[PDB]
């Protein structure tokens, strides 16, 4: 929140560990712990429950996804390509 | 002095206008600035046109055209005789 000037959530790692890596970790960790929108049920309850696996709490459904967020671009491009013909 | 009132181009009411690249040498030049020559030409020589007509299937002759639109940069055009240096008064004359 307003505790840190600019480090944010990687303040848990503190002064230990090189700063640029902490910035890289900050971006991944922010993506990892966000509560995403569930396509099925219309609530922002989709969380990562294990490395490739994202479960929505409300509708209790497991979507297999990317490592640090639900979707890559690659799958979307493939999906659209299949749909168009 | 300041030689160009208009910048040598259709500068008016516009910021960016895309560069084209010179036909002679690939030099970038704004489409507004660029020296454009249409060049409607036939491939045939006069003797060749006579020979093609004589050789021809059909009497009717379609006369194959070249349609170019060849764009020159300033440096090329003055070198290759598509423009001159005119004269200080004559630099405004659109003939």
């Amino acid at each position: 929140s307003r505790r840190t000037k600019k480090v944010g959530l990687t303040g848990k790692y503190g002064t230990r560990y090189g700063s640029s890596l902490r910035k890289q970790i900050k971006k991944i960790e922010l993506m990892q712990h966000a509560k995403y929108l569930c396509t099925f049920c219309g609530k922002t309850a989709t969380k990562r429950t294990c490395v490739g696996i994202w479960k929505c709490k409300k509708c209790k459904r497991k979507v297999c996804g990317g490592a640090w967020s639900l979707t890559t671009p690659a799958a979307v491009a493939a999906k659209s390509t299949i749909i168009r013909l | 002095p300041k030689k160009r009132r208009n910048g040598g181009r259709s500068k008016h009411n516009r910021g960016h206008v895309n560069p084209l690249r010179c036909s002679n040498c690939g030099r970038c030049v704004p489409k507004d600035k660029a020296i454009k020559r249409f060049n409607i030409r036939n491939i045939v020589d006069t003797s060749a046109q006579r020979d093609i007509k004589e050789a021809s299937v059909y009497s009717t002759f379609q006369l194959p055209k070249l349609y170019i639109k060849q764009c020159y940069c300033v440096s090329c055009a003055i070198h290759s005789r598509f423009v001159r240096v005119r004269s200080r008064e004559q630099r405004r004359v659109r003939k």
């Binding site: - | 560069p19 084209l20 690249r21 010179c22 036909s23 002679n24 040498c25 690939g26 030099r27 970038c28 491939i43 045939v44 020589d45 003797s47 060749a48 020979d51 093609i52 004589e54 050789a55 021809s56 299937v57 379609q62 194959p64 055209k65 070249l66 170019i68 060849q70 940069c73």
Partner: protein
């Protein structure tokens, strides 16, 4: 009667190729470049060389059998320049002079509808 073939003329600054084919264009009849019929195989392939190549093609095409050709012109690689190469007029004049019967003549140079960057920087070729 009479049989039509297709005479491709691909004319560029380095060389002007005369390549005659079937009416389909699927099957070749003669490949002759221009540079092969240059004596020392160098330079640009002159109007004279362009004439000699076209004469050889005409002799060969008559030898093979075909009596008539539709002409397909192509200028300097299209994207590089749209200019007809040096020998192109001479080659066309040579084919007409030779005695072959001349059907349709078209420019079929590949033409960019679009645009893309070409060799040398934004300053262009300095030489």
């Amino acid at each position: 009667e009479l049989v039509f073939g297709v005479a491709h003329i691909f004319a560029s600054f380095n060389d002007t190729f005369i390549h005659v084919t079937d009416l389909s264009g699927r099957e070749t009849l003669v490949r002759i470049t221009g540079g092969m019929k240059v004596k020392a195989d160098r330079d640009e392939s002159s109007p004279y060389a362009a004439m000699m190549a076209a004469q050889d093609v005409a002799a060969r095409l008559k030898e093979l059998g075909v009596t008539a050709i539709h002409i397909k012109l192509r200028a300097s690689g299209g994207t590089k320049s749209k200019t007809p190469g040096p020998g192109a007029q001479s080659a066309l004049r040579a084919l007409a002079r030779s005695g072959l019967k001349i059907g349709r003549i078209e420019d079929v140079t590949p033409i960019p509808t679009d645009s893309t960057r070409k060799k040398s920087g934004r300053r262009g070729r300095r030489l």
